[PDB]
Chain A
Amino acid sequence: KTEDQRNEEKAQREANKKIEKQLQKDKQVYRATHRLLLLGAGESGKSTIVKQMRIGIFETKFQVDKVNFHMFDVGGQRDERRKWIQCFNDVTAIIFVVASSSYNMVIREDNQTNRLQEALNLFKSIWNNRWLRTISVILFLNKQDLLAEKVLAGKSKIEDYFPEFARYTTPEDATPEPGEDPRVTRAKYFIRDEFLRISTASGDGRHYCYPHFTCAVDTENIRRVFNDCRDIIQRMHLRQYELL
């Protein structure tokens, strides 16, 4: 009180300063780091992809070309309902990993749907969420090798499980790498176009989807992620102004 109170204020006032400096120091580190949310269906090669990308929630930190990236994977919940998705609003992009090989496979309980159809429904639910309006998606159509073997010399046919395969005609404009049989090309392009159909339905130009084809043993995934993040930021800046 009186003279005594002034005494507390100078230390307290020194005290607010001691903190503010640390907050200013931490802000510079916080701004640079880019956060990616990793999400996908069970048994879709998630651990293999995350391991090859770099040597209840799991966070992995890595750097590429003097740029810091931070990754989040939240498998603990095991929940069909999802209100933890509300938190992930500030993420730069969402990595979605889906197993293309498992078309002729059955979810264990109720025989309600094929594994792929459930993945398509999950992607549709995520894409149209109200909170995730301005967040882009990167697709890794994993298990590419198995799909070729299941299509060539395989008793199972895409026609029975997916009736629309007969009506679909593969575009001759797009071509695979040399040496691939046309049949596997038709299979993969059917798998990709199906996702793109939901992707382009209600995008409105704010957020886009980048479909990639990946396999288990590869190292070029991280470069793909870096390039896609660069493109996402460039497109966001271009749309922020009136140019695009």
Chain B
Amino acid sequence: RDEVWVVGMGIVMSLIVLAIVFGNVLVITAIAKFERLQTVTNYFITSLACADLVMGLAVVPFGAAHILTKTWTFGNFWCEFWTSIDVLCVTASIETLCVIAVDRYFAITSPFKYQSLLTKNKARVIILMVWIVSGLTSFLPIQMHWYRATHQEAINCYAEETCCDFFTNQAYAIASSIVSFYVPLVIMVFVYSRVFQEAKRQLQKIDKSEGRFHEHKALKTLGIIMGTFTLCWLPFFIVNIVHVIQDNLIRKEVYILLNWIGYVNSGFNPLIYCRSPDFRIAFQELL
């Protein structure tokens, strides 16, 4: 009954929160403490870890109680604040992934000019720019009345403090979806296609050179990287676009379910982006 549903969901949300916070803090401490892992590339990784730590600490808890209680206890100023924090964290993480992909592409396809282009001071500018861009689409319209729409059922929950829910007009939903998801997605696809072509070419050359005396790795490395992100974040943005266009097509429960499916991707990122042996060695030292 209510005991059964409430009890089981309790054992899952707590595990999710603990796993996210533990993984992110472990990665951040590993980067900070040891000078060996300090590198130009790892600054993007620590930015991603910080953003996911903020999201796991902030949005998951308060949101968890809202579904379980069936009511929102905090007042009107905090519902908007929580929504803004959610949008900020999601956008920042998704864009940091694309920044990492572009850095890898430049490192691989231009071996001679990699050292000159990217420097320690240059990376800070990019990270600040992406954080400002993420903040601009998150806090500025949410703090204002731009996000709110005119639907009758909606006008109510903006008037009543009891129901905290997300109702938006078509323009903001479309703009946020395009800014957050699709533009990074096409860039990642093109980048990884070119990188895979380069890897295949090098393997063919080495096979021609030394085949007589002597593709799983590339497909295993990319398939994982692209597939986890696509599976975690693809359905939510398409249903977010759909539900505004078509009336009553998508139920609220399915929307919340896909939104929560999107959240859990934060825990997987430390596993995907920190498999290097240096990361393993360091973890043993503190642990």
* A touching B, CB within 8 angstroms: yes
A-side interface residues toward B, CB under 8 Å?
Answer: 31-32, 67, 171, 196-197, 199-200, 208, 210, 230-231, 233-235, 237-238, 241-244
Q: How many A-B residue pairs have CB under 8 A?
A: 53
Output the nearest chain B residue to A171 by Cβ-Cβ distance: B212
Whether B151 is near chain A, meaning CB under 8 Å from some CB there, is no
Contact A32 B116 (CB under 8 A): yes
Contact A244 B213 (CB under 8 A): no
Contact A242 B205 (CB under 8 A): no
Give the residues in chain A near B213, CB-CB below 8 Å: 196-197, 200
Contact A234 B198 (CB under 8 A): yes
Output the nearest chain A residue to B221 by Cβ-Cβ distance: A242
Whether B32 is near chain A, meaning CB under 8 Å from some CB there, is no
Contact A210 B217 (CB under 8 A): no
Report the separation of the CA atoms of residues A230 and B202 in the bound assembly, to the nearest whole angstrom: 11
Contact A241 B221 (CB under 8 A): yes
* Contact residues, B211-243 vs A (CB, 8 A): 212-214, 217-218, 220-222
Report the separation of the CA atoms of residues A67 and B212 in the bound assembly, to the nearest whole angstrom: 35
Give the residues in chain A near B221, CB-CB below 8 Å: 241-243
The 6 closest A-B pairs by CB, nearest first: A233-B111, A200-B213, A242-B221, A243-B221, A243-B218, A243-B199
Majority-rule SS of A interface residues: helix
Report the separation of the CA atoms of residues A231 and B112 in the bound assembly, to the nearest whole angstrom: 10
B-side interface residues toward A, CB under 8 Å?
Answer: 104, 107-108, 111-112, 115-116, 195, 198-199, 202-203, 205-206, 209-210, 212-214, 217-218, 220-222, 275
Report the minimal beta-carbon distance from A57 to chain B, rounded to whole angstroms. 26
Contact B214 A200 (CB under 8 A): yes
Report the separation of the CA atoms of residues A14 and B209 in the bound assembly, to the nearest whole angstrom: 57
Output the nearest chain A residue to B199 by Cβ-Cβ distance: A243
Contact A237 B111 (CB under 8 A): yes
Report the minimal beta-carbon distance from A164 to chain B, rounded to whole angstroms. 16
Contact B111 A244 (CB under 8 A): no
Report the separation of the CA atoms of residues A231 and B208 in the bound assembly, to the nearest whole angstrom: 14
Give the residues in chain A near B195, CB-CB below 8 Å: 243
Give the residues in chain A near B111, CB-CB below 8 Å: 230, 233-234, 237
Report the separation of the CA atoms of residues A234 and B105 in the bound assembly, to the nearest whole angstrom: 12
Of A31, A67, A210, A242, most B-chain CB atoms within 10 Å: A242
Contact B206 A238 (CB under 8 A): no
